[model samples]
Target: SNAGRALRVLVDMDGVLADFEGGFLRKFRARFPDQPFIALEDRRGFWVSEQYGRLRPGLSEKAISIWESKNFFFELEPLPGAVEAVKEMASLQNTDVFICTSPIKMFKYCPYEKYAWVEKYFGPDFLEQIVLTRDKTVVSADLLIDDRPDITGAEPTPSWEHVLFTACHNQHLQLQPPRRRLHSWADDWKAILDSKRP
Candidate 1:
């Protein structure tokens, strides 16, 4: 079916391709060792930006450090086998590999800033089809690998299948099932690829 269908692999950048949350938390915890990270309910997207500026104050300096460290690009150690699996899936005939992320505006730089970072971690070819969308439902895709459980919670639409990629965080939301569920990108991609081939 590889030849018959155009495989769309929509991947998320934060937790799946890179451990942005864990690394950011490490830096964050270094700043506030006493507090627990419980902003999920009160704030959106980890809420680190809410207090991080106040604790440190040198906002410009922090931004420089983050960029130099490739913070926005997710320079940390990738989840095991994530790169190879994405590359393999992307290699499929007629398949389009996309890294879709919802990077907020406070970061200042354009979202495409992610492209260079992705190229650094993945490759030049990985940059070609990247999509930056505020609305996840804007496009129909064959598969979506994301760190957020909310996306999986969205009602299933035609020709769209979402996989909730595992994160260091919460319970995998048991929602209306999509075409598949892959807890670890490193786990069983070859089989998935084989099964999808024909």
Candidate 2:
């Protein structure tokens, strides 16, 4: 590792930057008003489809449609402090920030909307840092801040370490030894992120 190299910081979009789970809940109830719902506090898994499947037969597929709907990605609200946190991280010395997000496989409106979503919030400069890919492992970085409990791709051993971004769905997960967790962006991000530097 070169001492002078930039400390690459990778941020995930869905659960980390954008309120993916919260948005899904909003859309779900709006679409299916009279159906059973899972409260955000009770969420226990990484994927909505996985958790929703436990509710009823075929419920998962229905939940999938909520995000698949047009404007789903574009309409999501940014997590509290997410925008400011990214901006602050980028402002730090020797740090290079990039958004490494994985899109849903369906690919109807996900990919395009993700790009536009970044442009809408981050404008032109940060928009150029968006990297949409299925294989997160291939994207090299010093640290990856994501909400997913498990991340795997073609590249077996990723160069970066995984830092669990706080989210309702991933709250119950216990990372393997030497676990790292970011409980809140606004509350406890500076000390954690500022420590990482080349």
lDDT of 1 by residue, 38-111 (tens): 33223234334544455456543553344344344544567778788777777767777778787764555546
What are the Cα lDDT values of the candidates? 0.62, 0.85
TM-score of 1: 0.69
Model 2 lDDT per residue over 98-185, tens place: 9999888879899999998888888877877888898899999888998887889899999988889878777777788886998868
Q: Model 2, residue 35: displacement in angstroms?
A: 1.1
Give per-model TM-scores: 0.69, 0.93
RMSD of each: 5.8, 2.3
State the lDDT at 151 in candidate 2. Answer: 87
The list of candidate 1 runs beyond 4 A from truth reads: 1-5, 34-74, 110-112, 152-158, 177-180, 193-198
The TM-score, computed over Cα atoms with residue i paired to residue i, of candidate 2 is: 0.93
